Swiss-Prot record, chain A:
Region (Disordered): 1-21
Functional description taken from the UniProt entry: Structural component of the virion that acts as a cement protein on the capsid exterior and which mediates the interactions between the hexons, including the peripentonal hexons, and reaches all the way to the penton vertices. Two hexon linking proteins IIIa, one from each facet, stabilize the unique edge interface between a pair of facets. As the virus enters the host cell, hexon linking proteins IIIa are shed concomitant with virion acidification in the endosome.
Protein modification: Cleaved near the C-terminus by the viral protease during virion maturation to form the mature protein.
Region (Peripentonal hexon-tethering domain): 1-103
Protein name (Swiss-Prot/TrEMBL): Pre-hexon-linking protein IIIa
Keyword presence, Phosphoprotein: yes
Main location group: virion
Domain of life according to the entry: Viruses
Shown stretch of the complete protein: 4 to 301 of 585
Provenance organism: Human adenovirus C serotype 5
Residues annotated with Phosphothreonine modification: 261
The protein's assembly and partners: Interacts with hexon proteins; this interaction tethers the peripentonal hexons to hexons situated in the facet. Interacts with the penton protein (via N-terminus). Interacts with packaging protein 3; this interaction is required to promote correct genome packaging.
Compositional bias annotation for Polar residues: 11-21
UniProt similarity note: Belongs to the adenoviridae hexon-linking protein IIIa family.
Swiss-Prot record, chain B:
The protein's assembly and partners: Homotrimer. Interacts with the capsid vertex protein; this interaction binds the peripentonal hexons to the neighboring penton base. Interacts with the hexon-linking protein; this interaction tethers the hexons surrounding the penton to those situated in the central plate of the facet. Interacts with the hexon-interlacing protein; this interaction lashes the hexons together. Interacts with host dyneins DYNC1LI1 and DYNC1I2; this interaction might be involved in intracellular microtubule-dependent transport of incoming viral capsid.
Miscellaneous comment: All late proteins expressed from the major late promoter are produced by alternative splicing and alternative polyadenylation of the same gene giving rise to non-overlapping ORFs. A leader sequence is present in the N-terminus of all these mRNAs and is recognized by the viral shutoff protein to provide expression although conventional translation via ribosome scanning from the cap has been shut off in the host cell.
Family recorded in the similarity comment: Belongs to the adenoviridae hexon protein family.
Entry superkingdom: Viruses
Protein name: Hexon protein
Localization of this protein: Virion; Host nucleus
Role: Major capsid protein that self-associates to form 240 hexon trimers, each in the shape of a hexagon, building most of the pseudo T=25 capsid. Assembled into trimeric units with the help of the chaperone shutoff protein. Transported by pre-protein VI to the nucleus where it associates with other structural proteins to form an empty capsid. Might be involved, through its interaction with host dyneins, in the intracellular microtubule-dependent transport of incoming viral capsid to the nucleus.
Up-regulation conditions: Expressed in the late phase of the viral replicative cycle.
């Protein structure tokens, strides 16, 4: 609701109190004293405050939804990055001017259809961010059209590797693939390091799938990122690519338990009393 | 008789400390308080002078 463009439009246009137009039932429960908490809080008002609320209740005042319907649209354009936040007042007066030149019963109905349409489109984008798959599956499958589907040797290792390659981009919503000129790439996160080169890695691994000092370090970076998404039976045991994928799974598991060992040794080296400079260097040389 | 005079304004004691680590200076403290590790010295002249 904090990211809802019509809840945010109600927090910027609608009053923060109980008027007798937007909240007719909640103020008639208070005029007629049938409220659970403090029923007699309306009898204790002056006639200027008490009779002016009765008149707005038995014959309520009409209002314009047009500034509220447009502000729900502007606050969804500013949320789906269609406009800048600095342009939020520029396009608000630009849209209010257009629905004033062309105001009709059709347009006010069409703004009522479009404020339900932008509630969906804000939520559809925020679902697509947390899923994180649609921008990557169409560009990884576009990569794999370029790569051949039949290697000469080790096709069993190759078709499970590229199936685990689809498992990184699916089971990590921040990861993405794209193109920049000839080659394609893979970032493990938005605005993060460890960017592998897919067109350079698969022109390096091609010719190494059945071999059983020769690897480019981005191919080894690819074999490090693909390692937690690869089973022991996904690739072979004797194959040099399969021998490394088991070796990189042990390196991740050792770096996962040297992380917990680091948090234990440095915790009991401060309380026991050591140099804080040398507690942090002798621990790494014990763990690396 | 020749009018020489000395007068002391102030005397301060200075002491330079090796900035030893607090686990190293506590190990060395605990070793040097054992009665087998007593620091024994010797006068260089080592004589009764008459």
């Amino acid at each position: 609701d904090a990211t809802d463009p019509a809840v945010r439009a109600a927090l910027q246009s609608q009053p923060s109190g109980l008027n007798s137009t937007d909240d007719w039932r909640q103020v008639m429960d208070r005029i007629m004293s049938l409220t659970a908490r403090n029923p007699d809080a309306f009898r204790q008002q002056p006639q200027a405050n008490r009779l002016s609320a009765i008149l707005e209740a038995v014959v309520p005042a009409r209002a314009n939804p047009t500034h509220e319907k447009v502000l729900a649209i502007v606050n969804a354009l500013a949320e789906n990055r269609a406009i800048r936040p600095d342009e939020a007042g520029l396009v608000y007066d630009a849209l209010l001017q257009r629905v004033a030149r062309y105001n009709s019963g059709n347009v006010q109905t069409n703004l009522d259809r479009l404020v339900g349409d932008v509630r969906e489109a804000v939520a559809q984008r925020e679902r697509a961010q947390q899923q994180g798959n649609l921008g990557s599956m169409v560009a990884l499958n576009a990569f794999l059209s370029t790569q051949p589907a039949n290697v000469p040797r080790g096709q069993e290792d190759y078709t499970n590797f590229v199936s685990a390659l689809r498992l990184m981009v699916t089971e990590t919503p921040q990861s993405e693939v794209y193109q920049s000129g000839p080659d394609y790439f893979f970032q493990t996160s938005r605005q993060g390091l460890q960017t592998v080169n897919l067109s350079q890695a698969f022109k390096n691994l091609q010719g190494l799938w059945g071999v059983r000092s020769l690897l480019t370090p981005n191919s080894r970076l690819l074999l490090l990122l693909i390692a937690p998404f690869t089973d022991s039976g996904s690739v072979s045991r004797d194959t040099y690519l399969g021998h490394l994928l088991t070796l990189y799974r042990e390196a991740i598991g050792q770096a996962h338990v040297d992380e917990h060992t680091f948090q234990e040794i440095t915790s009991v080296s401060r309380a026991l009393g050591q140099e804080d400079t040398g507690s942090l260097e002798a621990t790494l040389n014990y763990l690396l | 008789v020749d009018g020489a005079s000395i007068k002391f304004d102030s005397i301060c004691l200075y002491a330079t400390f090796f900035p030893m680590a607090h686990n190293t200076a506590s190990t060395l403290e605990a070793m040097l308080r054992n009665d087998t590790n007593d620091q024994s010295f010797n006068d260089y002249l080592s004589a009764a002078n008459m």
